[PDB]
Design a protein around this motif. Structure first.
Motif, PDB file in Angstrom:
ATOM      1  N   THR A  40       0.824  -1.196   0.000  1.00 21.69           N
ATOM      2  CA  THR A  40       0.000   0.000   0.000  1.00 21.69           C
ATOM      3  C   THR A  40       0.863   1.253   0.000  1.00 21.69           C
ATOM      4  O   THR A  40       2.079   1.221   0.233  1.00 21.69           O
ATOM      5  CB  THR A  40      -0.885   0.038   1.230  1.00 21.69           C
ATOM      6  OG1 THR A  40      -0.041   0.197   2.380  1.00 21.69           O
ATOM      7  CG2 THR A  40      -1.646  -1.248   1.335  1.00 21.69           C
ATOM      8  N   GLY A  44      -2.456   4.667  -3.209  1.00 20.45           N
ATOM      9  CA  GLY A  44      -2.780   3.505  -4.001  1.00 20.45           C
ATOM     10  C   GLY A  44      -2.306   2.239  -3.335  1.00 20.45           C
ATOM     11  O   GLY A  44      -1.839   2.247  -2.190  1.00 20.45           O
ATOM     12  N   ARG A  45      -2.469   1.136  -4.056  1.00 21.07           N
ATOM     13  CA  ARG A  45      -2.065  -0.172  -3.561  1.00 21.07           C
ATOM     14  C   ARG A  45      -1.669  -1.016  -4.760  1.00 21.07           C
ATOM     15  O   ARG A  45      -1.974  -0.675  -5.904  1.00 21.07           O
ATOM     16  CB  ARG A  45      -3.205  -0.843  -2.789  1.00 21.07           C
ATOM     17  CG  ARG A  45      -4.264  -1.431  -3.692  1.00 21.07           C
ATOM     18  CD  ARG A  45      -5.534  -1.751  -2.936  1.00 21.07           C
ATOM     19  NE  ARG A  45      -6.504  -0.681  -3.110  1.00 21.07           N
ATOM     20  CZ  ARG A  45      -7.711  -0.659  -2.565  1.00 21.07           C
ATOM     21  NH1 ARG A  45      -8.138  -1.643  -1.790  1.00 21.07           N
ATOM     22  NH2 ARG A  45      -8.515   0.372  -2.811  1.00 21.07           N
ATOM     23  N   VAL A  46      -0.970  -2.113  -4.504  1.00 20.13           N
ATOM     24  CA  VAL A  46      -0.612  -3.055  -5.557  1.00 20.13           C
ATOM     25  C   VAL A  46      -1.165  -4.407  -5.163  1.00 20.13           C
ATOM     26  O   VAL A  46      -0.863  -4.908  -4.076  1.00 20.13           O
ATOM     27  CB  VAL A  46       0.904  -3.122  -5.803  1.00 20.13           C
ATOM     28  CG1 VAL A  46       1.362  -1.965  -6.637  1.00 20.13           C
ATOM     29  CG2 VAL A  46       1.667  -3.141  -4.492  1.00 20.13           C
ATOM     30  N   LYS A  61      -1.117  -2.225 -10.017  1.00 19.97           N
ATOM     31  CA  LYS A  61      -0.993  -1.044  -9.184  1.00 19.97           C
ATOM     32  C   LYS A  61      -2.238  -0.208  -9.428  1.00 19.97           C
ATOM     33  O   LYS A  61      -2.565   0.115 -10.575  1.00 19.97           O
ATOM     34  CB  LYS A  61       0.269  -0.282  -9.568  1.00 19.97           C
ATOM     35  CG  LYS A  61       0.539   0.969  -8.751  1.00 19.97           C
ATOM     36  CD  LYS A  61       1.974   1.465  -9.037  1.00 19.97           C
ATOM     37  CE  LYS A  61       2.331   2.646  -8.209  1.00 19.97           C
ATOM     38  NZ  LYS A  61       3.798   2.878  -8.295  1.00 19.97           N
ATOM     39  N   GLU A 116      10.802  -8.789  -2.429  1.00 17.53           N
ATOM     40  CA  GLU A 116      11.700  -7.645  -2.442  1.00 17.53           C
ATOM     41  C   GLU A 116      13.089  -8.026  -1.963  1.00 17.53           C
ATOM     42  O   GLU A 116      13.248  -8.791  -1.000  1.00 17.53           O
ATOM     43  CB  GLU A 116      11.170  -6.557  -1.511  1.00 17.53           C
ATOM     44  CG  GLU A 116       9.842  -6.029  -1.948  1.00 17.53           C
ATOM     45  CD  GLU A 116       9.256  -5.009  -1.004  1.00 17.53           C
ATOM     46  OE1 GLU A 116       9.861  -4.696   0.038  1.00 17.53           O
ATOM     47  OE2 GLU A 116       8.173  -4.507  -1.332  1.00 17.53           O
ATOM     48  N   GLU A 159      13.589  -2.050  -1.235  1.00 17.27           N
ATOM     49  CA  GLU A 159      12.195  -2.444  -1.401  1.00 17.27           C
ATOM     50  C   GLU A 159      11.755  -2.424  -2.848  1.00 17.27           C
ATOM     51  O   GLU A 159      10.782  -3.104  -3.191  1.00 17.27           O
ATOM     52  CB  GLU A 159      11.305  -1.472  -0.630  1.00 17.27           C
ATOM     53  CG  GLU A 159      11.494  -1.514   0.874  1.00 17.27           C
ATOM     54  CD  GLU A 159      12.547  -0.529   1.421  1.00 17.27           C
ATOM     55  OE1 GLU A 159      13.540  -0.135   0.735  1.00 17.27           O
ATOM     56  OE2 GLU A 159      12.354  -0.159   2.585  1.00 17.27           O
ATOM     57  N   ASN A 160      12.442  -1.656  -3.695  1.00 16.96           N
ATOM     58  CA  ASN A 160      12.017  -1.481  -5.083  1.00 16.96           C
ATOM     59  C   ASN A 160      12.731  -2.421  -6.042  1.00 16.96           C
ATOM     60  O   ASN A 160      12.615  -2.253  -7.252  1.00 16.96           O
ATOM     61  CB  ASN A 160      12.186  -0.031  -5.540  1.00 16.96           C
ATOM     62  CG  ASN A 160      11.124   0.857  -4.992  1.00 16.96           C
ATOM     63  OD1 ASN A 160      10.104   0.380  -4.465  1.00 16.96           O
ATOM     64  ND2 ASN A 160      11.309   2.143  -5.153  1.00 16.96           N
ATOM     65  N   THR A 172      11.144  -2.193  -9.793  1.00 17.15           N
ATOM     66  CA  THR A 172       9.725  -1.830  -9.798  1.00 17.15           C
ATOM     67  C   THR A 172       9.537  -0.476  -9.110  1.00 17.15           C
ATOM     68  O   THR A 172      10.401  -0.001  -8.373  1.00 17.15           O
ATOM     69  CB  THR A 172       8.906  -2.891  -9.045  1.00 17.15           C
ATOM     70  OG1 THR A 172       7.497  -2.599  -9.092  1.00 17.15           O
ATOM     71  CG2 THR A 172       9.318  -2.859  -7.643  1.00 17.15           C
TER      72      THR A 172
HETATM   73  C1  LIG Z   1       0.847   2.120  -4.026  1.00 16.93           C
HETATM   74  O1  LIG Z   1       1.835   1.303  -3.373  1.00 16.93           O
HETATM   75  C2  LIG Z   1       2.623   0.704  -4.258  1.00 16.93           C
HETATM   76  O2  LIG Z   1       2.477   0.749  -5.477  1.00 16.93           O
HETATM   77  C3  LIG Z   1       3.664  -0.043  -3.558  1.00 16.93           C
HETATM   78  C4  LIG Z   1       3.797  -0.050  -2.228  1.00 16.93           C
HETATM   79  O3  LIG Z   1       4.977  -0.910  -1.828  1.00 16.93           O
HETATM   80  C5  LIG Z   1       5.387  -1.338  -3.199  1.00 16.93           C
HETATM   81  C6  LIG Z   1       6.543  -2.221  -3.489  1.00 16.93           C
HETATM   82  C7  LIG Z   1       7.854  -1.554  -3.036  1.00 16.93           C
HETATM   83  O4  LIG Z   1       7.743  -0.144  -3.269  1.00 16.93           O
HETATM   84  N1  LIG Z   1       6.607  -2.690  -4.905  1.00 16.93           N
HETATM   85  C8  LIG Z   1       5.543  -3.603  -5.392  1.00 16.93           C
HETATM   86  C9  LIG Z   1       5.813  -4.026  -6.839  1.00 16.93           C
HETATM   87  C10 LIG Z   1       5.073  -5.272  -7.326  1.00 16.93           C
HETATM   88  O5  LIG Z   1       5.158  -6.372  -6.418  1.00 16.93           O
HETATM   89  C11 LIG Z   1       4.809  -6.049  -5.067  1.00 16.93           C
HETATM   90  C12 LIG Z   1       5.489  -4.823  -4.464  1.00 16.93           C
HETATM   91  N2  LIG Z   1       4.604  -0.806  -4.185  1.00 16.93           N
END
Ligand code: A1JET
Length: 339
Positions: A40, A44-46, A61, A116, A159-160, A172
């Motif tokens: 999250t 937004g969220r994924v 996303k 990650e 994390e990315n 990502t």
């Molecule tokens: C709106 O929140 C987001 O879009 C978001 C929050 O935490 C993340 C992480 C690390 O940033 N990346 C995804 C990428 C795809 O697989 C799971 C994780 N994305």
């Protein structure tokens, strides 16, 4: 090197064609089943989703348009989708579909089940130098590609970086990526990874990505970042001092590379000199790296994440599962016309 030069020329040609004519509206929400929330943010969220016809899994996303506007992320979200639909590189997560509806923006990207790098790094403690170097080489090649397209990434952090089924990196979250031919000014990125010129509100350029690479390599090899402190203000003070203490277990070559990436003076920072990325690629710390073999994914990775299949979510965290509501009324149509 003529092969790199020709590769990058073709890469730019192909990027520009998609950049100038972006794809739009290539799927819709009811083509997918929702499986699980993977992450999250404030706007937004994924979610892991499955395509109903093909059975393929994707990371979708979902951005709430009204929250994007309130948090002043409109341009950033337009950058993210326009860049993602135009790039193509082995270590960048692929955007497969995008679309919007009355409430949300959607970017449907490949799903990488290994999780990650952040999780794996925290679990193991620190990576050996060869292991850190394998990931670092992929980031170097990725930044060489992005910067050649005049793109700055601006969100490098563990994390990315997702670890794929071959143990390779997929970068990502292009939410801060931007096409910049000179300088740009926005304050964005996570505190531990910000270059001094961002903290000091200067116009900055692609050199901030090379600084962030120094932070990433330090953190991979040490297990913690170089400017660590309890609150951001104290992190920022350490960053702008640039005083860095290296663990004695770091090799001399690693320390030398890091002093040149974590160079406070951006005009002296590796990646930002006359020889560009080649000062990094030719550095002694990378002497064992076969850059072409990395690009071709021919090197055996340091480890393969444990997962059961393309739908496994065990390497991601658990979040409260919330509705994906779509208003009966269109919100913020004007702001997102180009999406
Ligand atoms: C709106 O929140 C987001 O879009 C978001 C929050 O935490 C993340 C992480 C690390 O940033 N990346 C995804 C990428 C795809 O697989 C799971 C994780 N994305």
């Amino acid at each position: 090197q003529e092969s790199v030069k020709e590769f990058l020329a073709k890469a730019k040609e192909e990027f520009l064609k998609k950049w100038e004519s972006p794809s739009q509206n290539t799927a819709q929400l009811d083509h997918f089943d929702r499986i699980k929330t993977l992450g999250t943010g404030s706007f937004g969220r994924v979610m892991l989703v499955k395509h109903k016809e093909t059975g393929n899994h994707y990371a979708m996303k979902i951005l709430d348009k009204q929250k994007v506007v309130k948090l002043k992320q409109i341009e950033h979200t337009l950058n993210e989708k326009r860049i993602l639909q135009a790039v193509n590189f082995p270590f960048l997560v692929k955007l497969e579909f995008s679309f919007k509806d009355n409430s949300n923006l959607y970017m449907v990207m490949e799903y990488v089940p290994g999780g990650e790098m952040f999780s794996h790094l925290r679990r193991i403690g620190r990576f050996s130098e060869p292991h850190a170097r394998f990931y670092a080489a992929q980031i170097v090649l990725t930044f060489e590609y992005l910067h050649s397209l005049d793109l700055i990434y601006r969100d490098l952090k563990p994390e990315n970086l997702l670890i794929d089924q071959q143990g390779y990196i997929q970068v990502t979250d292009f939410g801060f990526a931007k096409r910049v031919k000179g300088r740009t000014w926005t304050l964005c990125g996570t505190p531990e990874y910000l270059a001094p010129e961002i903290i000091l509100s200067k116009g900055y350029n692609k050199a901030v990505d090379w600084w962030a690479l120094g932070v990433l390599i330090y953190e991979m090899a040490a297990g913690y970042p170089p400017f660590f402190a309890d609150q951001p203000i104290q992190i920022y003070e350490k960053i702008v001092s640039g005083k860095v203490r290296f663990p004695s277990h770091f090799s001399s070559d690693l320390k030398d590379l890091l002093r040149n990436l974590l160079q406070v003076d951006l005009t002296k920072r590796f990646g930002n000199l006359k020889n560009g990325v080649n000062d990094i690629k030719n550095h002694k710390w990378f002497a064992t790296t076969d850059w072409i073999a990395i690009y071709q994914r021919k090197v055996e990775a340091p480890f393969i994440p444990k997962f059961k299949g393309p739908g496994d979510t065990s390497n991601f965290d658990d979040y409260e599962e919330e509705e994906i509501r779509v208003s009966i009324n269109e919100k913020c149509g004007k702001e997102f016309t180009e999406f």
